[PDB]
Write a protein that binds this ligand. Sequence first.
Ligand SMILES: CC1=NN(c2cccc(N)c2)C(=O)C1
Ligand SMILES: [Zn+2]
Ligand SMILES: [Zn+2]
Length: 582
Amino acid sequence: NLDIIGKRIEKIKQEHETSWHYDQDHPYKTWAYHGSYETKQTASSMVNGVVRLLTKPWDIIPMVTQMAMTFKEKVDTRTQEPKEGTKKLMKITAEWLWKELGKKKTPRMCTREEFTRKVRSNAALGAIFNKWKSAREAVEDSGFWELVDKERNLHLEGKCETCVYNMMSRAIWYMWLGARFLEFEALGFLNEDHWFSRENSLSGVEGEGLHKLGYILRDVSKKEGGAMYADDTAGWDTRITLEDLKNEEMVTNHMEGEHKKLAEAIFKLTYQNKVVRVQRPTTVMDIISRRDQRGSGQVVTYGLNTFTNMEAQLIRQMEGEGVFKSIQHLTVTEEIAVKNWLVRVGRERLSRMAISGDDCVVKPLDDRFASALTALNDMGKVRKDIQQWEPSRGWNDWTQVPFCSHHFHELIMKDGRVLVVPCRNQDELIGRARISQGAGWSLRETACLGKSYAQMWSLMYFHRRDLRLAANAICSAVPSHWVPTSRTTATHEWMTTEDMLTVWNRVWIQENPWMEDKTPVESWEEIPYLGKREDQWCGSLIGLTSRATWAKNIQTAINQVRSLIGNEEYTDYMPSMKRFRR
Ligand SMILES: CC1=NN(c2cccc(N)c2)C(=O)C1
Ligand SMILES: [Zn+2]
Ligand SMILES: [Zn+2]
């Protein structure tokens, strides 16, 4: 309690001594409340005019148009302490999993240089505004790095002064850049050195890319076993227990010297004890604390979510196989059986999973998994939209399974080669591309964001008739040489000025380990679509009058956007499609 957080709290009080007050009408039950002070402030979604002018049929589709308009009663909840048998299963599995992840990797500190190049290339690091304007400016200024040193030496001393969360089923906890640096220094290696790559972690998909996920699910399908299970957790981040935070901290056991002390401090002082500042309109700043739940940087969060999810799912698999009888208490022979299971088949059981943070797909040994619920419920990883003790409903076809907001189709090319392609409801794809984040976008910057969406569609969703046509139209409407941009940046092979047919060949043929025949594709017409009926099932407007007028008159929409942007060098990509090829 207050010895670890007091200094952070004491320091905040003094900068707002002309406001402090212990309010007695504070809404917090599960968050420890400390005091309040005076403020007054709020970022809504803006429409991308280049994308919207080139997708006119969707102007009358509510699922698209509503996306551009616009629970914290889940953050103020508590999770019970697991039983002793559950805690033992988790500690033993966590110990074994950090060992496996560490067999071919070396933990190491990330550097001011690595951090500097990150901010100078626009990764969403979740910092705040204040003494410097942007993150770009603070990084080129030794004043900052002296503040970072003060905090750093404080951490080595086992104390914290300035590592405070700012709160804003989504809730994102910004820290000042300096705090983000010390987190990145201690734990950035997990992401930077690909600890959750498939090659290293066997369940993981970190860095795989949306063009590999479908092939990965198909490889899991090839295993002998039961249905494929894809149970979502109800508010994963709010269900992370202090016991989970302590099993995650065991990664420091693989570390040494300075690194071990810096990493232990981030875990102790910022994760297992948190200080948070929240806005309350009643507008005061509430300074609140708690020990449990997830509040890290979004990238360390991804890695620790993958870790703890892998652990939970192996334990659920153990329960389905009857490795242990009861979560109440693990016998001594049951611990030995859990350890022997992990040594004998642990790696085979990891390869039956695809896990991305809180998202998973498991192909267990058989369907006893469906009703193995006691450990999963007692760890607090309660399934979304199903009664606590109702058995999971599995999928019989890998092309039906949901994963990372997608499903995957098997698509046979005119030459017999097999593509496994990602897909989702087309209203979701068009609706997202019509949205921009932030203020002060020039027309040029708005056009270059539209071009990023268009190139993503050409690479990933080429098999959707409407998206190949709209992607070609947007690339025709934006100057040929203008570089695709994004303000928050899986692999992103569409972020290039190289010709998209050449990128398609590299991604889908040359570098695709599931394609034996490396014969390049010579034109877009060699690259197939979904069946017309499947395309309509996944949201295509093919067959509608509005869509036929749009397609036929597309050069008029292209010329409207060219006229707005002005006298520039443009390319006509529309003859890359059969129907416009004369
Ligand atoms: C663009 C281009 N597309 N084509 C093309 C592609 C496939 C078949 C046919 N007949 C033509 C070109 O010759 C140039
Ligand atoms: Zn600190
Ligand atoms: Zn689909």
